[PDB]
Each structure stands twice: as structure tokens, then as C-alpha cells.
Amino acid sequence: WRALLEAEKTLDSGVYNKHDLLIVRGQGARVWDAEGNEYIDCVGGYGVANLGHGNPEVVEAVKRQAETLMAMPQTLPTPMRGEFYRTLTAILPPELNRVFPVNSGTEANEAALKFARAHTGRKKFVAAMRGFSGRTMGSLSVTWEPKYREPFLPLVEPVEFIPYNDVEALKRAVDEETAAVILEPVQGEGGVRPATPEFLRAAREITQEKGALLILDEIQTGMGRTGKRFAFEHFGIVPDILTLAKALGGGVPLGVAVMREEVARSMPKGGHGTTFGGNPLAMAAGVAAIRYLERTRLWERAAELGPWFMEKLRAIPSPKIREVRGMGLMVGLELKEKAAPYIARLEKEHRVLALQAGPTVIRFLPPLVIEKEDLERVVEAVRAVLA
Amino acid sequence: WRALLEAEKTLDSGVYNKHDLLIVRGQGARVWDAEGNEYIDCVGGYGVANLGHGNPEVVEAVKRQAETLMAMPQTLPTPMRGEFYRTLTAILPPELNRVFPVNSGTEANEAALKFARAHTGRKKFVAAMRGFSGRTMGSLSVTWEPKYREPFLPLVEPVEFIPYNDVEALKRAVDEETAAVILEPVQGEGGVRPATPEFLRAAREITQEKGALLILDEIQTGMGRTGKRFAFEHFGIVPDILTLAKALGGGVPLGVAVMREEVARSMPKGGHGTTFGGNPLAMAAGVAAIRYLERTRLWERAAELGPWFMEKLRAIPSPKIREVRGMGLMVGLELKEKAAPYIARLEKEHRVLALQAGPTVIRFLPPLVIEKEDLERVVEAVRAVLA
Ligand SMILES: CC(=O)N[C@@H](CCCNCc1c(COP(=O)(O)O)cnc(C)c1O)C(=O)O
Ligand SMILES: CC(=O)N[C@@H](CCCNCc1c(COP(=O)(O)O)cnc(C)c1O)C(=O)O
């Protein structure tokens, strides 16, 4: 197995910080390396494995569809597509009744940004500082992190960034020339920073007032992650465009921009598209994923465990800890120093896999099926490495 | 079944022209609608089913990897990824030895454009008229079709288009300002237009002389479609970045940007990325797809049937036929009127699903495993419908 690791490391583009280990398989919220070591996976593929590694129903759906049909374009209707369509819209407010399936989060936002422009005839986009929307050039344009943007300038214009949760700043940025505002109900890559009810409320009201669209990015907070099916249910607001990805396919590269009918209706024929978007395999996976989510109301696990976990974290007697924040099982542990050293130690010394969300934040995105015994172990592990 | 169709038609964004039928399963180059009818699939997942619908090896690989692990990021090495990397670079010339995996063709080109700006420090992009690179804002900027860009402007600048196959045009276009040239060895969406040896040759020579990068988009021409493993093999040139997708994963959403190490090396850590890009499910399907292609040298079938198919089409006695062209099984039949009505007859009266490559061109992108008898049947259907 040493050869594969070296092959991946050597042949990789080199843009990634790869860890010295080879993960071979997973079940639930546990994963194993090539040497047999077992790990608690709070990385869960960056919040993709919400339903847990090896979710039977999803796996089964993927097997049966792979045998039946995998390649079929949007020009040729195929059963799983129609099913995914009504299956996804049925768990959303009736207003969001139109879907443009894609293959990733960045593509979903790319779709949002484009439909927004075709519909309004406006060009400007408003986003929040420390907001992450994707790496493709359109999505990168509304992505704040300067170092992620500067080397590839110029990108799509014009875009205006406003401090996250700053209601008055939002109010002043959005005008009649604004095509849309794009925000995350809880900023992920930006440190796990939950939106305030007033901020999102303001974002909703402002946009309708100026004729701008509201694009809510639930690519990371979606699929029960925050405690409810979607975090926008926490704020009582309903967007014009909702973008989803990650856990949407239960692992299969899947994403979608769901929007109001008048919005989708303004898009000219052949005005946008995608080869893979809406393929039968991804459609069969999403159907399965959504049905498991709803059948088990998996968001409840996150609502119950999220608080308990964060409470334990806030109990760790360590002066290096600034704050414990998040919603559901989307948690961030902000330290008063670099988080990287501790993450490396959680892995090597405690077989615990965690992510970052900015240099001083240890982020936890465990499969929602994770058990309380593993949560206590994570806490213990953290207390340990910080001592 | 009628429920699932109206549902798909009704809940879709509406940017696609959908055919009146519902495809349920496929095998080889045959597909079945919901009423039990069988079709010869000249659409092939839109050039994605090169290895045949239901290809045993790919299906098998997907089923087994789905049971093992599907979600795992680029920061955590995983066996199938390491394998995909070495298996892919192994079927390519030695200069293309670095891999940046993604989830679609457009993502592939976006990464190509980005790595190009990061490497040359330049900004200008040169593309060809009738060229197609993708729908995401970045790829859309180097895509020709005015009506595809028109309503989404302003996009990424600065971009210069030159007439396809115009050597002197391209030469005057590429300067010390150019980060890269992006071209398809054979324009697909642009109506199936093969490059000439002299043109691609100049693109390689000019780019090197001027220090700009050559991006060869083989997303549609790749994986044996034109008669050889990759279309560049016909021309004896090696680009700086090679973008793939469509058939690369036997059906599973997958694409990739393969580049020379100096180009990969210039990308700052975390300068680019993707959640799904390089996921184990796609990596395992990509290994299987390539092994199958290499074991059967599948491209020889296109190389053998392609010319034999194109001459059969040309020999049709219809004054409506203008020209027949293509490479291997990437074929386009241009008529002296609108194709759409004819494609409709092909479907309704002959159970033959085909595509367009512009309003007057019928395009064929059949699985490479298609039988000769099925191609003979196709020709008869075309002759019949044009009477
Ligand atoms: C039915 C549909 O949606 N059609 C797509 C087109 C699909 C086929 N072309 C893809 C393609 C692409 C874009 O690849 P992707 O994102 O569709 O996977 C890039 N380069 C070349 C040479 C290509 O042929 C569209 O209109 O956007
Ligand atoms: C190491 C790596 O590749 N990580 C990615 C980031 C992954 C997680 N973020 C995804 C994301 C995206 C982009 O989605 P996708 O293309 O990765 O599927 C959009 N919106 C929100 C709220 C998101 O959280 C990167 O560095 O580009």
C-alpha cells in the first residue's frame, strides 16, 4: 500500500496538503487506514458523508442503478431524474419547485449566479466577507478569501463583499442594479459562523425590496447538518434560489440549484447546461439519500448531539480555547493559536480526523449517524492534545 | 411511467428541449423507453458511453467501491485515487505527469485556465470560434456561441477568438500577454470540425515560442472516440494541459486536468480545489474504464467503423446532404436545411436516437461497442427519413 500513497503524492497536482496515511474504507463514522488502524472521522469527506460511510440504502441504490443505466442527457427523460425532482421539491417550500441538477457545489452556485443574471438583467452580486462559494471562476468571484482570488484576476465583475451579519452594510450594498445576494446560513470555510436571524431576515427583505434575488448556499449546512432538514428552516426565510451539494448524493458527485418558477422561466432555451448534471446514477443516489434522511429524520440526531457535544467541548479547562460555536453537528472550536499542530496530533496520537476552518479553528463535520461514545472520545482527544 | 415523465418535464428548469419518451435502461449501444421499445443509441450519454451501456467491468468497480468508501477528500490519500493517477498518466506521454481530478469537463477546463494564469503570470486567453469549453462562468468565457455568453456578461476577460484552423490568425493572436490557447482536436458542439495537422502543429509551436500554454480539450474527443486513445495522438503533439471528462469514468461523474509538472508546481498551496474531485467512487470507475479501454484497444473499433460509416452516409442519394465529416466514431452529417425534423423522424419511425451539432447537422456519438449491423441500420434510417 506504500506504493499507492507515494503515487498519489507524487502524481498529484501538489495544491493539496496531503496527510501521511492511506484511508481505505469506512462504515458509519469510522474509517480505517492501510495498516488496520481505526479512526473516528469528524471530517466525513468535508460534510459529504452525513448519512454515514456505507449507508446501505444509498449503496444499494447505487448498485442497482449502475447496472441499469448511468449515461443519459437532459434531452432524454429518464425515470430516476423525474423521481429525484419530485423527491427533492417535496421536502422544500412549494415555492422552490424548479430544479437544475449539477455535479458539485461550485457548479450549483455557478448555476445560481447565471439564472440570477438572466432573470434580472442586472450584473452585480453581493456576498459576505469570508464567504465560500466554489473554485470555478464564477463561484470564485463571490468567494472572499483574497489569496484564493488574486492570482486568477480578473474574475467576473462586479462583486461587492459586506461583513457577515452586518445588517446595515447589507442594506447599503443592495441596489436596483444588484442581480443577487449569495450567503451561507452558517459560514463553513469561514470558521463555522452562524448567521443571525436579523441578518438573514434583512437579506430576504432587502432583495425583494430592490428586485434582487436571494441565493442561499446550503451546500455544507444542507441535508440535516445543522439540526433541521435545511438551516433556512431555522431562520424562517425562503430564498429565490437554493444551492445544495456534498451530502445530497450520499457520496455520488451531486448538486442542485432549486429555484422559483418565474426565475427558471426567464432562462432562455439552451442558455445553460451540463453533460453529467442530472445523470441517472446521481439521480438514483439523491433519491435514496433524501428518502433515508426523511425516513430517519436524521437531522434530529444533529439537533440532539450537536448541543451535547459542544457543551462537552466548552467544558475542557484549556486557556487556548476562545469559543465553541456552530449549529447541529457543524461545530467549530476556535483556539487562540494555530490549529494545524493539534489536528495533526489528533490524527497520529488519537486516531481522530478533524478539519480546519481558518488557521485557528478545528472544525467537526461528523457523519450524522455518529454515536455519543465517539463524541466523548473526540472531546477527550481534544482535551488531551491541548493540555 | 407517464407520471415520472411529466414530473421531469414539469419540475425541470426548462432550459432543455426534452424528447417525448422516457429511457429506462441501456446495454451496449441499445436503450429501452418505458413502453418497452428498443433504440439504437447514437447519443450515448452524449459521448459518455464510449465503453458501452452497462459495461461489466465499470459496473463491477462501481458496485465494489460503493460498498467500501465513497467520500474522502484530497487531504486524506486513498488507494483508488493513487491508482487512478498512475493508471491515467501511464496511458499518456511522459510530460503529462500531474493530475488534478474533478467532476465534469467544464471543471476540467476551469482548472486548466486557473493553473495557466498561476503559471504564466499572464491573463489573456485565446480560443477558437465555434469552440466550446463549458457552462461555468470561467469556461463560458472561452466558449464561442454568442447566445451562450450574451446574457451573462461581463464574463472573464480578456479573451480573444480566432477562426478555427486559421494558422496565421492564431499566430498573430498569441503574444507575451497570452497565458494559454485552448482548443478541441475536433470541435464537437461546433458541428464536428476536425483540426488540420498544420493547425494543431502551429498551436504547439506558437505557444512554446511565446511562452503561453497549450490547452487541448479532449473531453469529447477522448477515450478512443476518434480512432486513437486520444486525438492528439493523430497529430503527434503534446499539450501543456490536457482536459478530460465524459467517458473518463464509464458513466460516473468524472473529469480531469493532466499537466506538465512545471505547470502543476506553480499552483500555490490551496490555490484551487474541489470537494468531490478525486473521490474514491469516481477514481475506481476511472481505473476500470481505462483498464478496459487499454485491454480491448477499443479505439480501433472507432478507427475501423468510423471511415466505413462515414462513406456509407456519403453514398446516400439525397440532394439534402451537404457534407459528411468527423474522426473515428465522432461524426457529423450536415444537411442543406434544419436537422431537428429529421432527428424526430429517426426517433419516432426508426428507434434511432441522434444528436445535433448545430441546426443543420446531425451528430453521431455512438458507444464504441456498437455493432456494424447497427451502423448499417442507422444509415438506412437516415436515407429513409430524408426521402
Ligand atoms: C444537453 C446539454 O446540457 N448539453 C451541454 C453540452 C454537453 C457536451 N459538451 C461538453 C463539452 C465540455 C463541457 O463539459 P461538461 O461540463 O458538460 O461535462 C467541454 N469541452 C468539450 C469539447 C465538450 O464537448 C451544454 O449545452 O452545456
Ligand atoms: C481540500 C479541498 O479540496 N477543499 C475545497 C473546499 C471544500 C468545501 N467547501 C465547499 C463549498 C462549496 C464549493 O462546493 P464544491 O465545488 O467543493 O462541491 C460551495 N459552498 C459552500 C458553503 C461550501 O462549503 C477547496 O479548498 O476548494
From Swiss-Prot, chains A, B:
Q: Which InterPro entries match?
A: AcOrn/SuccOrn_fam, Aminotrans_3, Aminotrans_3_PPA_site, Class-III_PLP-dep_AT, Class-III_PLP_Aminotransferase, LysJ, PyrdxlP-dep_Trfase, PyrdxlP-dep_Trfase_major
The disruption phenotype is: Auxotroph for lysine.
**PANTHER family in the record, alphabetically?**
ACETYLORNITHINE AMINOTRANSFERASE, MITOCHONDRIAL, AMINOTRANSFERASE CLASS III
Q: In which pathway does it act?
A: Amino-acid biosynthesis; L-lysine biosynthesis via AAA pathway; L-lysine from L-alpha-aminoadipate (Thermus route): step 4/5
Q: Which GO terms describe its biological process?
A: arginine metabolic process; lysine biosynthetic process via aminoadipic acid
Q: Where does substrate bind?
A: R135, T274
What's its catalytic activity? Answer: [amino-group carrier protein]-C-terminal-gamma-(L-lysyl)-L-glutamate + 2-oxoglutarate = [amino-group carrier protein]-C-terminal-N-(1-carboxy-5-oxopentan-1-yl)-L-glutamine + L-glutamate
Pfam families from the entry?
A: Aminotran_3 (PF00202)
Q: What is this protein called?
A: [LysW]-aminoadipate semialdehyde transaminase
Listed GO CC annotations: cytoplasm
Modified positions (N6-(pyridoxal phosphate)lysine) are K246
Which HAMAP family does its entry note?
A: LysJ_aminotrans_3 (MF_02084)
**Necessary cofactors:** pyridoxal 5'-phosphate
Q: Which organism is it from?
A: Thermus thermophilus (strain ATCC BAA-163 / DSM 7039 / HB27)
Quote one Gene Ontology molecular function term.
transaminase activity
* This protein's UniProt keywords: Amino-acid biosynthesis, Aminotransferase, Cytoplasm, Lysine biosynthesis, Pyridoxal phosphate, Transferase
Subunit relationships: Homodimer.
| Signal sequence annotation | none
Q: Where does the UniProt annotation locate this protein?
A: Cytoplasm
Family from the record: Belongs to the class-III pyridoxal-phosphate-dependent aminotransferase family. LysJ subfamily.
Q: What does this protein do, in the record's words?
A: Catalyzes the transfer of the amino group of L-glutamate to [LysW]-aminoadipate 6-semialdehyde, generating [LysW]-gamma-L-lysine. In vitro, can use N(2)-acetyl-L-ornithine and N(2)-acetyl-L-lysine.
Give binding positions for pyridoxal 5'-phosphate.
Answer: G105, T106, F132, D217, E218, I219, Q220, T275
Q: What is its EC number?
A: 2.6.1.118
